[PDB]
């Protein structure tokens, strides 16, 4: 317990040191004069401030944190800036939701939550009243997140942090210049388009202000109009005189030539309302909402309800359907009707829809179902399936044949209906052929749109856009697809999309699945609505009313990082003075152009040339973005617009486009989802309070480095705390007893073994750090490192050589630095080292000899087997080692060598090997042992390479054994071990013992 407290004390002291020394503040004015090794620009997409920062954000930023901790030791000058996102509606949604139940009820509010979560954060009762305005959120949460980050100890130049709404005037001017240049180059466009839309919010709902289906778009439906013919059913008598239409949703208009009736749900509530032209549409509630927002009614979003009813009161109504062969069809019931899709009204195409003919047969069999709703004989019997589309494998009546073949007798046969619908699902999309006149012998793929247009021009069909899946907004409002006018980014331009495809070709994605997602979201993208009305951010500069959504004012902000320290200089809101003395309003479009475009002319500005040149130098030095780390959730939306805007703003300078992007999965805590509902959740401050942020970073580096979800194990973090405490106390012990170690030459066998192991570990760690596999880098550089250390301590009977010990300590403190830099800086100061550890470089690795590491692993295996066999049955041990392989083993290994040499290293199957070795007489007595032997061989062939195929070992087995017999006798608690050369041994040993696998008897 006190170990974590000691760690936190060290962290706070070293953070005070890092702040007072200002070691992480980098400036292009100083670093461009010393061309050290090149720049390294990492970026973390700023998170939203609608709450404290949790462990997922920390895991996502740990990637670039460790990356800069590694690259700064390799000589590259690192830039890790960090912004803070406050654009967007979520803040406002939560706050006004709070006001809703704060003023319609009391304080505390009476029930039968949100205020509960706020008090769970622990604010004072008289302080949540101050949370009505978002101004207090932006004055409160950015400082707290910054404090949490500084307590974590990130290598950030904090003078470059800022806020993203109009509260910050400098970022506001930056966004204004961005959008002015974008609309200047025809990248923005005003127009009336379809989009997901939140009625309660009154604006298009994009991916970052939703609550379900974070990538759902609109989906098109052909909406057929069916004239309700007289005699009107009873419940409609009040609306006599006007036109009454049943609106039915479909995606297969070409099948409407074979309509027989109209399926409705008898126990669902339908609503009939008035359209814009005075007619009456009958649909469901949400269908009416969607239609109203798609300009179907007189007023946008207004549904004048003229009658509410049930499906039972609708059955038997005569209908005039479009394109049907029957001049009169009827309204029939259907019980298997989903209450979410479409209008609650489906078409009856029994020739190519299986559920339709199923229901038709259920009605046609008995008087029970046919009379079950007043459906007289005339509404079921004469309605036969109408052959309209011929699928070659089934005939003119496809669904009929496939259902009669799969032996289905229940419209409610969900398994069999699913089967039958799957069988001809797509074979009617291509292989289907029209049969009606005008289209006799047409590919249905080439006529469905023309038939849709034919119905629309006839005034019998319309377009209905619906959310492909149910979408909830930030305001708990069910989104609908609305046709609204807005300013949108035309991400569908051919030239722009092709240029971004070239950028993706040049972009470095760390896996192929990331590039797959990028190509898919590039092919899927189209006009994207960037205009909002409710929320925060920056207004459109030419249209002061339209606000900019969070996913559009956050595309090229990384250029603002390069000058945030000289424009507002640390102050988040930009209210204070400018360190360069540049007024907030003084930044004009041409000023930004000169700062960010290379060939831009110096504009007419009262700003002196020195400051503009300094900003241009900063930008032209740090850019482009070398790396952007994020979770894979921002792949389809954020990083796509990121590359798009980087291509659009600099269409001539590909050298300034993003260099690389790294995607990680979402974080799991104790193998469980991080959710406030399950009690398995850790904010950054709680995680630091519990796991000594150094150690939290350690466990995060071990959490994972793949696209799959990483796992944060608390027990692993505690184990890391214990290991670090043992390491620190061991280093203290060594500092104490330096005078109690061996001096002189590092010439002992174990000294060489440990030194080569250390150098190999250095190499493995560097190679894992370049590839950003932080889990594997930790495995090679900390765990295996400590293992080699403890092995060398165990085997060094003549005392550990001080030079090797402290070279190891130095190298370990270096390799662990990017993970737990507080403890590493503490140890670096404990060594009496003059400067801070952030100035150190990469440790140079000496020569590596594979053969001595192989002999060390050999001794390890020998010790393991010795402790195994000591279990049963002493004082003396006797070991036997074979020079050459026994004749049968030598022959089998020669055969395996031939089979390896002949075919580029592919040993045949066990079958061929057993067959050919049964074809050798010299193995007749040993065919029982031959196949096991070979088997074992194969294992090691995949375990430690082909070196086991050599007819003789790379080292002296007997001398290697004899260089550590002392440790073996001391650990095995014996009295003597005689090593004999296996030829003096008896028959069994001399016959079965092979080189590399010695035997022994006590």
Ligand X SMILES: CC(C)C[C@H](N)C(=O)NS(=O)(=O)OC[C@H]1O[C@@H](n2cnc3c(N)ncnc32)[C@H](O)[C@@H]1O
Cβ of residue 556: shortest distance to ligand X, in angstroms?
Answer: 11
Give yes or no for residue 215 binding ligand X (CB under 6 A): no
Residue 250 contact among ligand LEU, ligand X, none, beta carbon within 5 to 8 Å by kind: ligand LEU
C-alpha angle 841/846/851, rounded to 5°? 145
Task: Answer yes or no: are the C-beta atoms of 83 and 161 closer than 8 Å.
Answer: yes
First CA to last CA across the chain, in angstroms? 47
Give the residue carrying structure tokens 């209210």: 575
Cβ of residue 217: shortest distance to ligand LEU, in angstroms?
Answer: 17
Give yes or no for residue 630 binding ligand X (CB under 6 A): yes
Residues 810-869 that bind ligand X (CB under 6 A): none
Nearer to ligand X, 206 or 417 (CB): 206
Give the binding range for ligand X (CB under 6 A) out of 28-36, 67-75, 120-128, 626-634.
626-634
- DSSP readout, 262-282? EEE-TTSEEEEEE-SSS-EEE
Give yes or no for residue 56 binding ligand X (CB under 6 A): yes
Cβ of residue 788: shortest distance to ligand X, in angstroms?
Answer: 34
Query: What is the rounded CA–CA span in Å between residue 522 and residue 99?
Result: 41
- CB under 8 Å to 978, separation ≥6 — which residues? 876, 877, 878, 879
> In this chain, which residue has its C-beta nearest to ligand X?
56
Sign of the Cα pseudo-torsion (795, 798, 799, 802, in order): negative
The site string for ligand X over 728-767 (x = CB under 6 A, - otherwise) reads ----------------------------------------
Nearer to ligand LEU, 252 or 854 (CB): 252
Give yes or no for residue 633 binding ligand X (CB under 6 A): yes
| Strand arrangement of the beta sheet that strand 999-1001 belongs to | 976-980, 876-880, 999-1001
- Altogether, the residues listed in the chain come to a count of 1002
Cβ of residue 749: shortest distance to ligand X, in angstroms?
Answer: 48
Nearer to ligand X, 704 or 995 (CB): 704
Which one among 11, 28, 41, 60 touches ligand X, defined by CB under 6 A?
60
Give yes or no for residue 631 binding ligand X (CB under 6 A): yes
Q: What is the dihedral of CA 916, 919, 925, 931, to 10 degrees?
A: 10
Nearer to ligand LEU, 193 or 448 (CB): 448
Task: Answer yes or no: are the C-beta atoms of 758 and 807 closer than 8 Å.
Answer: yes
H-type alpha helices, 434-493: 448-457
Task: Output phi, psi for 492, to 5 deg.
Answer: -95, 5
Residues 344-363 that bind ligand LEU (CB under 6 A): 346-347, 349, 353
Cβ of residue 411: shortest distance to ligand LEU, in angstroms?
Answer: 12
Binding site feature residues for ATP: 676
Give yes or no for residue 136 binding ligand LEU (CB under 6 A): no
Task: Answer yes or no: are the C-beta atoms of 685 and 150 closer than 8 Å.
Answer: no
Peptide bond into 231 cis (omega under 30): yes
Number of amino acids touching ligand X (CB under 6 A): 19
Cα atoms found within 13 Å of the Cα of residue 259, Cβ hemisphere only: 28
3-state SS assignment for residue 93: helix
Nearer to ligand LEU, 470 or 841 (CB): 470
Give yes or no for residue 560 binding ligand X (CB under 6 A): no
Residues 1-60 that bind ligand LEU (CB under 6 A): none
Give yes or no for residue 251 binding ligand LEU (CB under 6 A): yes
Cβ of residue 91: shortest distance to ligand X, in angstroms?
Answer: 11
- CA-closest candidate to residue 630, choices 59, 48, 39, 212: 59
The site string for ligand X over 653-692 (x = CB under 6 A, - otherwise) reads -------------xx------x------------------
Query: What is the rounded CA–CA span in Å between residue 266 and residue 630?
Result: 50
Residue 396 contact among ligand X, ligand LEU, none, beta carbon within 5 to 8 Å by kind: none
List strand residue ranges (DSSP E) for 507-652, in order: 508-509, 528-529, 531-532, 547-548, 627-631
Nearer to ligand X, 638 or 764 (CB): 638
Query: What is the rounded CA–CA span in Å between residue 584 and residue 138?
Result: 19
Residue 251 contact among ligand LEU, ligand X, none, beta carbon within 5 to 8 Å by kind: ligand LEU
Q: Is residue 198 within a helix (H) or strand (E), and if so which, with residue range?
A: strand 188-198
Cβ of residue 688: shortest distance to ligand X, in angstroms?
Answer: 17
Give yes or no for residue 537 binding ligand X (CB under 6 A): no
Binding site feature residues for L-leucine: 46, 48, 551, 554
Which is it for strands 329-333 and 318-320: parallel, antiparallel or unpaired?
antiparallel
H-type alpha helices, 796-849: 802-816, 821-830
Residue 720 contact among ligand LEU, ligand X, none, beta carbon within 5 to 8 Å by kind: none
- CA-closest candidate to residue 228, choices 102, 321, 116, 158: 321
Give the binding range for ligand X (CB under 6 A) out of 53-61, 105-113, 479-487, 829-837.
53-61
Give the binding range for ligand X (CB under 6 A) out of 530-538, 582-590, 632-640, 653-661.
632-640
Cβ of residue 789: shortest distance to ligand X, in angstroms?
Answer: 34
Buried b / exposed e along 791-820 (16+ C-beta atoms within 10 A): bbeebbeeebbbbbbbbbbbbbbbbbbbbb
3-state SS assignment for residue 84: strand
HEC assignment per residue over 697-755: HHHHHHHCCCCCCEEECHHHHHHHHHHHHHHHHHHHHHHHCHHHCECCCCCCHHHHHHH
Residue 346 contact among ligand X, ligand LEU, none, beta carbon within 5 to 8 Å by kind: ligand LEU
Cβ of residue 347: shortest distance to ligand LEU, in angstroms?
Answer: 5
Number of amino acids touching ligand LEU (CB under 6 A): 8
Nearer to ligand X, 522 or 551 (CB): 551
Cβ of residue 400: shortest distance to ligand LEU, in angstroms?
Answer: 14
Give yes or no for residue 595 binding ligand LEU (CB under 6 A): no
Nearer to ligand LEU, 355 or 549 (CB): 355
Residues 23-52 that bind ligand X (CB under 6 A): 45-48
Cβ of residue 175: shortest distance to ligand X, in angstroms?
Answer: 13
- CA-closest candidate to residue 795, choices 977, 967, 957, 960: 967
Which one among 62, 165, 203, 250 touches ligand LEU, defined by CB under 6 A?
250
Phi-psi region of 84 (alpha: psi -120 to 50; beta: other; left: phi over 0): beta
- CA-closest candidate to residue 81, choices 28, 41, 50: 41
Which one among 17, 151, 200, 252 touches ligand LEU, defined by CB under 6 A?
252
Nearer to ligand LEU, 12 or 252 (CB): 252
> In this chain, which residue has its C-beta nearest to ligand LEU?
251
**Six-digit token pair at 9?**
């004390």
- CA-closest candidate to residue 51, choices 82, 90, 81, 87: 90
**Six-digit token pair at 388?**
């309209």
3-state SS assignment for residue 200: coil
Give yes or no for residue 1000 binding ligand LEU (CB under 6 A): no
Which one among 551, 643, 917, 993 touches ligand X, defined by CB under 6 A?
551
Give the binding range for ligand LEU (CB under 6 A) out of 55-63, 248-256, 657-665, 968-976.
248-256
Nearer to ligand X, 554 or 748 (CB): 554
Residue 79 contact among ligand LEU, ligand X, none, beta carbon within 5 to 8 Å by kind: none
Give yes or no for residue 454 binding ligand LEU (CB under 6 A): no
3-state SS assignment for residue 766: helix
Helix axes 512-524, 640-649, angle to 10 degrees: 70
Give yes or no for residue 554 binding ligand X (CB under 6 A): yes
Instruction: Provide the binding-site residues for ligand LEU, judged by CB under 6 A.
Output: 249-252, 346-347, 349, 353
- List residues near ligand X by CB under 6 A: 45-48, 56-57, 59-60, 85, 551, 554, 630-631, 633-634, 638, 666-667, 674
């Amino acid at each position: 317990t006190a170990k974590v407290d000691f760690l936190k004390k060290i962290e706070k002291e070293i953070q005070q040191k890092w702040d007072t020394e200002r070691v992480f503040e980098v400036n292009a004015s100083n670093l461009e004069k010393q061309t050290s090794k090149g720049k390294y620009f990492v970026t973390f997409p700023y998170p939203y401030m609608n709450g404290r920062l949790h462990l997922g954000h920390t895991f996502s930023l740990s990637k670039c944190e460790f990356a800069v901790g590694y690259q700064r030791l390799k000589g590259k000058c690192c830039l890790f800036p960090f912004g803070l996102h406050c654009t967007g509606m979520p803040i406002k949604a939560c706050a006004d939701k709070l006001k809703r139940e704060i003023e319609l009820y009391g304080c505390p509010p009476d029930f039968p939550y949100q205020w509960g979560i706020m008090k769970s954060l622990g604010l004072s009762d008289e302080e949540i009243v101050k949370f009505s305005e978002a101004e207090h959120w932006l004055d409160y949460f950015p400082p707290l997140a910054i404090q949490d980050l500084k307590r974590m100890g990130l290598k950030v130049d904090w003078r470059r942090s800022f806020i993203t709404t109009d509260v910050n005037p400098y970022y506001d001017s930056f966004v204004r210049w961005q959008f002015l240049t974008l609309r200047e180059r025809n990248k923005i466009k005003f127009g009336k388009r379809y989009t997901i839309y939140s009625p309660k919010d009154g604006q298009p709902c994009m991916d970052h202000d939703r609550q379900t289906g974070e990538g759902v778009g609109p989906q098109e439906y052909t909406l057929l109009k069916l004239k309700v013919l007289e005699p009107y059913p009873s419940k409609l008598s009040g609306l006599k005189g006007k036109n009454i239409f049943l609106v039915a949703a479909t995606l297969r208009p070409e099948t409407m030539f074979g309509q027989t009736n109209c399926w409705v749900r008898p126990d669902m509530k339908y609503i009939g309302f008035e359209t814009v032209n005075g007619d009456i549409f009958i649909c469901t509630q949400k269908a009416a909402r969607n239609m109203s927002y798609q300009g179907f009614t007189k007023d946008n979003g207004v549904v004048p309800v003229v009658k509410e009813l049930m499906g039972e009161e609708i059955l038997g109504a005569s209908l005039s359907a479009p394109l049907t062969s029957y001049k009169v069809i009827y309204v029939l019931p259907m019980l298997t009707i989903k209450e979410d899709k479409g209008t609650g009204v489906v078409t009856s195409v029994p020739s190519d829809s299986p559920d339709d003919i199923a229901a038709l047969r259920d009605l046609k069999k008995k008087q029970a179902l046919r009379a079950k709703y007043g459906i007289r004989d005339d509404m079921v019997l004469p309605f036969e399936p109408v052959p309209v589309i011929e699928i070659p494998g089934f005939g003119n009546l496809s669904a009929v044949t496939i259902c009669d073949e799969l032996k289905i007798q229940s419209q409610n046969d969900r398994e069999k209906l699913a089967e039958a619908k799957e069988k001809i699902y797509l074979k009617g999309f291509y292989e289907g052929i029209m049969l009606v006149d005008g289209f006799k012998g047409q590919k249905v793929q080439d006529v469905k749109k023309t038939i849709q247009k034919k119905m629309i021009d006839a005034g019998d069909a319309l377009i209905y856009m619906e959310p492909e899946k149910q979408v909830m907004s930030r305001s708990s409002d069910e989104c609908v697809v609305a046709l609204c006018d807005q300013w949108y980014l035309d991400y569908g331009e051919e030239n722009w999309k092709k240029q971004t495809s070239q950028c993706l070709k040049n972009l470095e994605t760390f896996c192929e699945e990331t590039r797959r997602n990028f190509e898919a979201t590039l092919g899927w993208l189209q006009e994207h609505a960037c205009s909002r009305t409710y929320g925060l951010g920056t207004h459109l500069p030419w249209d002061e009313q339209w606000l900019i959504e969070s996913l559009s004012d956050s595309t090229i902000y990384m250029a603002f990082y390069t000058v945030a320290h000289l424009l507002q200089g640390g102050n988040l809101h930009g209210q204070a003075e400018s360190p360069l003395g540049i007024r907030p309003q003084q930044m004009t479009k041409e000023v930004w152009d000169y700062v960010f475009f290379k060939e831009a002319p110096f504009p007419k500005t009262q700003i002196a040339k020195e400051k503009l040149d300094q900003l241009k130098q900063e930008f032209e030095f740090w850019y482009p973005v070398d790396l952007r780390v994020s979770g894979k959730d921002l792949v389809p939306n954020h990083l796509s617009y990121y590359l798009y805007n980087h291509v659009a703003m600099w269409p001539e300078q590909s050298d300034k486009w993003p260099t690389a992007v790294r995607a990680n999965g979402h974080l799991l805590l104790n193998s469980e989802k991080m959710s406030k509902s399950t009690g398995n959740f850790l904010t950054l401050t709680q995680a630091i309070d519990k796991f000594s942020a150094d150690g939290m970073r350690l466990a995060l580096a071990d959490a994972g480095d793949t696209v799959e979800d990483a796992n944060f194990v608390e027990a692993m973090a505690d184990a890391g705390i214990l290991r670090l405490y043992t390491w620190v106390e061991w280093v203290k012990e060594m500092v104490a007893n330096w005078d109690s170690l061996r001096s002189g030459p590092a010439s002992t066998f174990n000294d060489r073994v440990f030194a080569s192991e250390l150098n190999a570990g250095i190499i493995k760690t560097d190679q894992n750090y370049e590839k950003m596999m932080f889990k594997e880098a930790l495995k090679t550089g900390f765990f295996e490192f400590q293992a080699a250390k403890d092995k060398y301590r165990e085997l060094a009977v003549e005392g550990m050589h001080r030079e090797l010990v402290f070279r190891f300590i130095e190298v370990q403190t270096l390799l662990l630095a990017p993970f737990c830099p507080h403890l590493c800086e503490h140890i670096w100061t404990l060594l009496g080292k003059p400067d801070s550890i952030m100035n150190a470089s990469w440790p140079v690795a000496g020569p590596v000899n594979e053969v001595l590491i192989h002999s060390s692993q050999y001794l390890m295996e020998v010790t393991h087997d010795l402790r195994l066999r000591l279990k049963n049955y002493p004082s003396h041990c006797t070991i036997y080692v074979a020079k050459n392989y026994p004749p049968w083993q030598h022959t089998t290994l020669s055969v395996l060598r031939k089979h390896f040499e002949a075919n580029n290293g592919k040993l045949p199957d066990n079958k061929v090997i057993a067959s050919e070795l049964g074809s050798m007489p010299e193995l007749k007595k040993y065919m029982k042992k031959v196949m096991p032997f070979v088997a074992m061989i194969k294992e090691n062939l995949e375990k430690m390479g082909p070196r086991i195929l050599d007819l003789q070992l790379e080292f002296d087995e007997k001398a290697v054994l004899m260089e550590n017999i002392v440790y073996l006798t001391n650990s095995l608690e014996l009295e003597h071990i005689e090593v004999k050369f296996a030829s003096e041994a008896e028959d069994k040993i001399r016959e079965d013992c092979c080189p590399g696998k010695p035997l022994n008897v006590f």
